[PDB]
């Protein structure tokens, strides 16, 4: 996932360059795992909104004949209704009337009475086919973008068959199902998938649009730098690569624009980069600021102030907090016996 911030591993050189040489990172996760191909496909998700506790409808037969007796009672002592729970994970049935609380098979089950015993498609129709785009490097699929554009990588993804449908559980916990994902692990059953509600969709689309807005703001900055033949140091904060990877770093030193090749490593908490108020951790030791300028728009504060990255923006992090809080896993029923 998109980190909160990206810090260079270590600054090596500072070679002054021309301003037109600037180029916005265009940061993508597809091309960061080495997947520049992108194909359109149709995957499967849970039905939108709270989709759990299937509550299967059935009847009890008191001693194929039981189906004739039930159809006759609609228009052997049939006792109905006998609504039972279903764990969608293994197509499991749940009720204390079952011997030890669980019946798992496949069209008929048992009961705590040997004289009275207890379709399966309508209750298990809990999926929507939706449109997505998978990133490919030839045959390999690095990851996919869902319907509302959020990119999930398959690194850390397992296999998990919800309600008799082969699918995969992503690293964050969502569940999709498409043809040939090339997954190998199989997902210890204590791992859970998440709800698919419309708030999830809205917040995801908001993070998508926030990222595209990042790149468009960068492009606007460069477009102004060209027709202005001048560049403000704080505007350099727009040219940071948002994801970890090999990129460039920029600074305005000695009155000129300088760049360097550098490796961006993750920053998901502010405290790591500035443990000591005054210090900015680049590598092992803190690096020295000069003349009221650090790099990438980070400033030495004029007076009684300290290294100030653009931590005032805080709009992507807001929507990612809203996303991380608004997810809820789908747990199993309770097993109740006698």
Author numbering: 1 to 63, 92 to 103, 132 to 162, 167 to 178, 184 to 403
Give the article text.
After receptor engagement, lyssavirus enters the cell via an endocytic pathway, during which the G protein undergoes a series of pH-dependent conformational transitions to catalyze the fusion of the viral envelope with the endosomal membranes, thereby initiating the infection. Similar to its vesiculovirus homolog, RABV-G also consists of three domains: FD, PHD, and CD.
We also crystallized MOKV-G-ecto at pH 4.0 and determined the structure at 3.2 Å resolution. They interact via crystal contacts that are unlikely of biological relevance. The overall domain-arrangement mode in the structure is similar to that observed in the post-fusion structure of VSV-G, as indicated by the extended linear conformation and the proximity of CTR to FD. Helix F1 is unfolded as a preceding loop, orienting back towards the PHD and FD domains. This allows the F2 helix to be arranged in parallel to helix C. Consequently, the CTR loop is shown to extend over domains PHD and FD, enabling multiple amino acid interactions between CTR and PHD-FD along the interface. The CTR residue H397 forms a salt-bridge with D143 in FD. Finally, hydrophobic interactions among residues Y145, L257-I260, P394, L395 and P398 also contribute to stabilize the post-fusion architecture. In contrast, the FDs of MOKV-G1-436* were observed to extend away from the central axis of the VSV-G trimer. These findings suggest that the complete post-fusion structure of lyssavirus G is similarly characterized by a straight-linear conformation as observed in the vesiculovirus homologs, which in turn indicates that we have solved the structure of MOKV-G in the post-fusion state.
